[PDB]
Amino acid sequence: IGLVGKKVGMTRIFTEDGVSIPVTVIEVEANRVTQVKDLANDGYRAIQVTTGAKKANRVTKPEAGHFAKAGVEAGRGLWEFRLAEGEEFTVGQSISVELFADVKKVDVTGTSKGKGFAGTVKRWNFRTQDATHGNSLSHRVPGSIGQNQTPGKVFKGKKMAGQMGNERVTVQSLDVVRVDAERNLLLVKGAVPGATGSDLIVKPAVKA
Amino acid sequence: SRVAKAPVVVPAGVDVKINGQVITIKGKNGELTRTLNDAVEVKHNTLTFGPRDGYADGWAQAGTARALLNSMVIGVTEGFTKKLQLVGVGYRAAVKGNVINLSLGFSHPVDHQLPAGITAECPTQTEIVLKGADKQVIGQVAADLRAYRRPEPYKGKGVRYADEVVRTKEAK
Amino acid sequence: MKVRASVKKLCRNCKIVKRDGVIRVICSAEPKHKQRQG
Amino acid sequence: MKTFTAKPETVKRDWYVVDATGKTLGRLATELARRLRGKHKAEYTPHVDTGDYIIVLNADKVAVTGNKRTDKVYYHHTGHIGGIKQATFEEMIARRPERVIEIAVKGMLPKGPLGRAMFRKLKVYAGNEHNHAAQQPQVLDI
RNA sequence: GUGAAGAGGGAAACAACCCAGACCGCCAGCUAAGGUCCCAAAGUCAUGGUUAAGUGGGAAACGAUGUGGGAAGGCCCAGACAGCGUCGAGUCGGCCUGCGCGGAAGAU
RNA sequence: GAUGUCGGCUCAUCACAUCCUGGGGCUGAAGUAGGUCCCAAGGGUAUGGCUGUUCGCCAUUUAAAGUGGUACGCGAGCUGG
RNA sequence: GCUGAAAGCAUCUAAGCACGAAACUUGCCCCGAGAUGAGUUCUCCCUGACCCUUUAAGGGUCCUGAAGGAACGUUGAAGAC
Ligand SMILES: C=C[C@]1(C)C[C@@H](OC(=O)CS[C@H]2C[C@H]3CC[C@@H](C2)N3C)[C@]2(C)[C@H](C)CC[C@]3(CCC(=O)[C@H]32)[C@@H](C)[C@@H]1O
Ligand SMILES: [K+]
Ligand SMILES: [K+]
Ligand SMILES: [K+]
Ligand SMILES: [K+]
Ligand SMILES: [K+]
Ligand SMILES: [K+]
Ligand SMILES: [K+]
Ligand SMILES: [K+]
Ligand SMILES: [K+]
Ligand SMILES: [K+]
Ligand SMILES: [Mg+2]
Ligand SMILES: [Mg+2]
Ligand SMILES: [Mg+2]
Ligand SMILES: [Mg+2]
Ligand SMILES: [Mg+2]
Ligand SMILES: [Mg+2]
Ligand SMILES: [Mg+2]
Ligand SMILES: [Mg+2]
Ligand SMILES: [Mg+2]
Ligand SMILES: [Mg+2]
Ligand SMILES: [Mg+2]
Ligand SMILES: [Mg+2]
Ligand SMILES: [Mg+2]
Ligand SMILES: [Mg+2]
Ligand SMILES: [Mg+2]
Ligand SMILES: [Mg+2]
Ligand SMILES: [Mg+2]
Ligand SMILES: [Mg+2]
Ligand SMILES: [Mg+2]
Ligand SMILES: [Mg+2]
Ligand SMILES: [Mg+2]
Ligand SMILES: [Mg+2]
Ligand SMILES: [Mg+2]
Ligand SMILES: [Mg+2]
Ligand SMILES: [Mg+2]
Ligand SMILES: [Mg+2]
Ligand SMILES: [Mg+2]
Ligand SMILES: [Mg+2]
Ligand SMILES: [Zn+2]
Numbered sequence: 001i002g003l004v005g006k007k008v009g010m011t012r013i014f015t016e017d018g019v020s021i022p023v024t025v026i027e028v029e030a031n032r033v034t035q036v037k038d039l040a041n042d043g044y045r046a047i048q049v050t051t052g053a054k055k056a057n058r059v060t061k062p063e064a065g066h067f068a069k070a071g072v073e074a075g076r077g078l079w080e081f082r083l084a085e086g087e088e089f090t091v092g093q094s095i096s097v098e099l100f101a102d103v104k105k106v107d108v109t110g111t112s113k114g115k116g117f118a119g120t121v122k123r124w125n126f127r128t129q130d131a132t133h134g135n136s137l138s139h140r141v142p143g144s145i146g147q148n149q150t151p152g153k154v155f156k157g158k159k160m161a162g163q164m165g166n167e168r169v170t171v172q173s174l175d176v177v178r179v180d181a182e183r184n185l186l187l188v189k190g191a192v193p194g195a196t197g198s199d200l201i202v203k204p205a206v207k208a
Numbered sequence: 209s210r211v212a213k214a215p216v217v218v219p220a221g222v223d224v225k226i227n228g229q230v231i232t233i234k235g236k237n238g239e240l241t242r243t244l245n246d247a248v249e250v251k252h253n254t255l256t257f258g259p260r261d262g263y264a265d266g267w268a269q270a271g272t273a274r275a276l277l278n279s280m281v282i283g284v285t286e287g288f289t290k291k292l293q294l295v296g297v298g299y300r301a302a303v304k305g306n307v308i309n310l311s312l313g314f315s316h317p318v319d320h321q322l323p324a325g326i327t328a329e330c331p332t333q334t335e336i337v338l339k340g341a342d343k344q345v346i347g348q349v350a351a352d353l354r355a356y357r358r359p360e361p362y363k364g365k366g367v368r369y370a371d372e373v374v375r376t377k378e379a380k
Numbered sequence: 381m382k383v384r385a386s387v388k389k390l391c392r393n394c395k396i397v398k399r400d401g402v403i404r405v406i407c408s409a410e411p412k413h414k415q416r417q418g
Numbered sequence: 419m420k421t422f423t424a425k426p427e428t429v430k431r432d433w434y435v436v437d438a439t440g441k442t443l444g445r446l447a448t449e450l451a452r453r454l455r456g457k458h459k460a461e462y463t464p465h466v467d468t469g470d471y472i473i474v475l476n477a478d479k480v481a482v483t484g485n486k487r488t489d490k491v492y493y494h495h496t497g498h499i500g501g502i503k504q505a506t507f508e509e510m511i512a513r514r515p516e517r518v519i520e521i522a523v524k525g526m527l528p529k530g531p532l533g534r535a536m537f538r539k540l541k542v543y544a545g546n547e548h549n550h551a552a553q554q555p556q557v558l559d560i
Numbered sequence: 561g562u563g564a565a566g567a568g569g570g571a572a573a574c575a576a577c578c579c580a581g582a583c584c585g586c587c588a589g590c591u592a593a594g595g596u597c598c599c600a601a602a603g604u605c606a607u608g609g610u611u612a613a614g615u616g617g618g619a620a621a622c623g624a625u626g627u628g629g630g631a632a633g634g635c636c637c638a639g640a641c642a643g644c645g646u647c648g649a650g651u652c653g654g655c656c657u658g659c660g661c662g663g664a665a666g667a668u
Numbered sequence: 669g670a671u672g673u674c675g676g677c678u679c680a681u682c683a684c685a686u687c688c689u690g691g692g693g694c695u696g697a698a699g700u701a702g703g704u705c706c707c708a709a710g711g712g713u714a715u716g717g718c719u720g721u722u723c724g725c726c727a728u729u730u731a732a733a734g735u736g737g738u739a740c741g742c743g744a745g746c747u748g749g
Numbered sequence: 750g751c752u753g754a755a756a757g758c759a760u761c762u763a764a765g766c767a768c769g770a771a772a773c774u775u776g777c778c779c780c781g782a783g784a785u786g787a788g789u790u791c792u793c794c795c796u797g798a799c800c801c802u803u804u805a806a807g808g809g810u811c812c813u814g815a816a817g818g819a820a821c822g823u824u825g826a827a828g829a830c
Contacts, residue, residue, distance in 0.1 A: 042790055061816060062793040114827055129678055134747055143678025144742035151668045155499035195826035210757045245764040268755035269764060275753060344752040348767060351751055362698055379698040381693035383706060385663040386623045397760060403624045417662050421587055448598045526598040643758050667683035667737045691770040710771050
């Protein structure tokens with residue numbers, strides 16, 4: 001399994017031998033198990049967890065009853081983690097960042113920062129055409145988008161301008177620099193997706 | 209045909225158990241078994257082999273069926289032997305249980321886990337002698353061991369079948 | 381392996397064999413005689 | 419007089435269960451297609467679904483002749499350029515064995531709204547069990 | 561000869577090919593070419609064969625113990641042919657022919 | 669009663685008769701490194717000098733600097749030598 | 750390649766068995782139930798009267814107005830809207 005945390009921000013750890021390790025600080029508060037999915041009822045094995053602390057007015061009656069069944073406080077959302085062959089968890093169990101104590105590398109999933117409507121230069125690394133040498137109104141425009149009568153259409157997946165970022169991104173195989181269970185902190189080497197404050201899903205590295 | 213016509217003699221010791229198409233041959237050296245091709249008739253002394261009706265091949269399938277069960281009879285009775293020789297400076301072999309550990313001039317160990325039914329011993333470092341009931345399996349293991357370092361055509365170095373003539377040619 | 385439209389026995393030790401719908405010449409004596417029709 | 423027409427709101431559709439085990443794919447498919455369309459009924463009407471509900475069991479055990487188990491290829495295009503995908507019969511059986519029968523029958527049913535409606539009455543199962551004991555399907559031998 | 565100046569049915573689609581020349585109406589019948597497992601009207605028709613290549617459903621010289629049929633030979637229980645005198649039954653490769661096989665690489 | 673044209677730029681997309689990388693047979697294959705043929709289309713596959721050039725030659729790289737199809741791909745996308 | 754007949758031999762193949770590549774199917778990442786074949790799981794909410802006519806998934810009234818949603822406002826490392 002993994003845990004749900006919050007991107008606090010970035011800093012550095014100076015090592016004794018004079019290396020500065022860039023770190024993303026992830027606040028990993030206790031993940032409370034809200035539901036355990038099994039093969040008989042649900043057709044797959046997973047835990048649903050919550051974290052943080054939502055305010056009663058913002059918790060709907062459907063949400064409240066789900067948390068109340070688990071016997072846990074409402075957190076700011078629900079996330080599932082698929083269970084391994086061995087792994088067992090109970091409803092209402094709290095899972096801390098101590099989970100990651102012996103984990104060397106993590107995959108961190110977040111929602112990337114939103115660039116809104118992005119041109120092909122930004123979105124797809126298209127080359128600009130001539131700034132001068134006669135170019136007419138076509139500096140950052142995409143150029144040709146197809147062939148001719150054959151095929152007489154634009155192909156699906158054509159790289160064009162559109163919404164960029166504000167989407168799920170996983171960065172794989174980030175070194176765990178420090179697990180500070182007392183401060184509810186995980187320090188990972190390097191950048192992770194999303195703005196300060198955003199939800200992060202941290203899992204042990206799939207690749208190894 | 210001429211293979212299939214010849215009935216396999218049963219030695220004493222080695223009981224036969226036919227059923228359907230699947231035959232079982234059990235003796236001193238284990239209990240082999242085979243499902244024969246559905247175009248084949250076996251008839252217990254002596255297992256006969258001839259063609260079943262409504263089957264174009266027939267005598268082809270009966271000749272193999274014969275040859276297989278001859279080897280199966282001989283396998284549970286006498287057993288089959290294969291010897292590989294190693295050739296090349298610093299090429300050695302040694303068996304630890306059911307794993308042969310071959311040094312074959314690689315930058316790593318080579319450890320072939322011998323399959324069940326096959327026993328192996330190294331009379332010296334440059335010889336393996338496999339022993340088993342299945343002629344097919346012992347041939348397959350021998351081929352697998354040879355394939356690590358096939359005999360090469362200049363100096364004849366590698367894992368060879370002890371029988372094999374390794375044709376050597378000269379360098380240009 | 382010689383891949384040819386015309387595959388033939390080149391010596392006494394050459395043998396024509398059909399494997400998987402492909403006419404081949406295998407030779408015990410001479411590896412240069414190994415042929416596949418193709 | 420005017421020739422009879424079946425009326426969709428009054429059509430009698432019966433439930434059948436067929437075992438695909440060891441049946442030749444195409445020879446089963448034609449009989450399924452016939453009955454899904456209702457060509458076996460005197461009330462057959464081209465513009466009306468007069469056919470029967472058919473449960474097919476043991477779709478994974480459907481047979482093909484020749485080398486078709488390895489050599490029959492199912493092609494589809496994803497709509498994306500270069501997106502021609504292929505699967506052999508044996509791969510289709512391993513992954514999605516119901517699709518073999520369903521694809522065979524779909525190609526033998528009329529094209530258009532009614533042919534799609536006819537196909538909805540076919541219920542293909544990989545194994546020997548179905549959930550439709552409430553519909554009381556009669557054994558149909560093909 | 562047809563199209564042009566000709567509809568209808570067949571050849572997926574297809575002026576010029578095949579069948580066939582539309583005065584009008586019919587919710588009758590028989591046929592033509594072409595067809596009769598499902599799309600899709602009609603044989604999952606009958607009898608005897610061939611093919612195993614999805615050949616059928618693209619492609620030549622040429623290559624090959626694929627496989628079927630026919631005629632005729634050589635050698636052979638004075639032991640042939642293959643394997644190692646032994647061994648006990650056929651063997652050998654030309655001919656003609658049917659159907660297949662390789663030869664066979666292209667762009668949404 | 670108009671189907672805009674060479675070359676460049678931008679953006680491509682497919683084929684495989686494969687340039688590199690992968691697998692393999694033969695070699696007049698000791699090794700290294702080649703030659704040749706077979707399989708393989710996943711990905712990758714120079715920058716400059718000269719010239720409108722494509723190309724080519726030249727300089728210097730690169731694992732490699734593939735060959736073709738796409739209205740000799742692409743001017744209601746740019747350029748206009 | 751193994752075993753192995755047809756074809757007493759031989760033969761990787763006909764039966765059977767084993768290897769074998771960046772191609773293929775997965776494994777990795779993202780989308781994804783309009784997957785109309787519209788799936789699953791958990792939780793939450795509403796437990797009134799009444800009369801017609803075309804007695805039917807018929808129609809209307811009186812009362813009721815839930816969960817939740819939307820709207821509005823303050824807004825955002827979300828955003829052309
Ligand atoms: C005017 C026609 C043009 C624009 C250009 C034409 O090129 C020529 O005709 C060459 S002669 C040349 C054309 C124009 C007009 C006068 C003068 C002479 N110039 C400036 C050219 C390249 C073809 C050879 C003939 C067909 C064309 C369509 C497709 C094509 O490639 C064109 C015509 C239909 C097109 O409209
Ligand atoms: K006429
Ligand atoms: K075909
Ligand atoms: K190109
Ligand atoms: K080579
Ligand atoms: K490639
Ligand atoms: K043109
Ligand atoms: K131009
Ligand atoms: K245009
Ligand atoms: K323009
Ligand atoms: K749904
Ligand atoms: Mg933004
Ligand atoms: Mg540029
Ligand atoms: Mg201007
Ligand atoms: Mg400008
Ligand atoms: Mg089109
Ligand atoms: Mg093969
Ligand atoms: Mg139609
Ligand atoms: Mg005229
Ligand atoms: Mg006409
Ligand atoms: Mg016509
Ligand atoms: Mg027509
Ligand atoms: Mg008639
Ligand atoms: Mg019909
Ligand atoms: Mg019949
Ligand atoms: Mg064909
Ligand atoms: Mg041919
Ligand atoms: Mg015009
Ligand atoms: Mg090729
Ligand atoms: Mg591909
Ligand atoms: Mg792959
Ligand atoms: Mg240049
Ligand atoms: Mg052009
Ligand atoms: Mg081009
Ligand atoms: Mg312009
Ligand atoms: Mg244009
Ligand atoms: Mg000019
Ligand atoms: Mg043999
Ligand atoms: Mg690589
Ligand atoms: Zn030879």
